[PDB]
Structure formats: structure tokens, C-alpha cells
Amino acid sequence: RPKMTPEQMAKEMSEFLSRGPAVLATKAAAGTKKYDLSKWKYAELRDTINTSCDIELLAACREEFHRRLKVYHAWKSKNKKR
Numbered sequence: 489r490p491k492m493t494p495e496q497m498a499k500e501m502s503e504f505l506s507r508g509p510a511v512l513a514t515k516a517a518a519g520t521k522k523y524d525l526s527k528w529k530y531a532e533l534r535d536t537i538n539t540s541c542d543i544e545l546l547a548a549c550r551e552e553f554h555r556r557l558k559v560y561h562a563w564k565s566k567n568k569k570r
Contacts, residue, residue: 497530498560501553504534508550514543523548526556 525533525548533549540546 492530494560494564498557500534501530501557504537505550505554505557512547520544520547520551525549525552528552 523544528536528549533552537546537549
């Protein structure tokens, strides 16, 4: 496989979410972090959603992106500067 970059995955992730819909409303009694895919690799996540059909699952992945996205941008912004 080719060489992967944090900026590349960050762009693919961010846009991935912006592309997906947002008419969700399953919010009930609060509960969605029931799926911990933090370990899943960017390739695994994107892949799963690319070849999956599970609502809850799909959501989990997307959520794992948004999370590691704001964090990646935060830590990066803090690490960038000297």
C-alpha cells in the first residue's frame, strides 16, 4: 500500500462526515458511545463504513473520526508551534 499522511486522512475524514447526512434523531436516553472503535485504523474505519450496512456501527465510525479529528487538530496546533 502507498504512504499515508495525517493531513490526508484528516481531510478524507472531515469531508467524509460533511458528505454524510445529518437528519439523525435516534437520541434516546442518551447512549451511542457503546461502540469503541478508537483502536480501529483509519483504513479499517473508512473501509467498514465503505462496505457496511449497520446504522449504529456506521455512526460509531463517523463519531470516531470527528473525535480524533478535533483532537488531531488540537494536539497538532499545540505541537506545531515551538
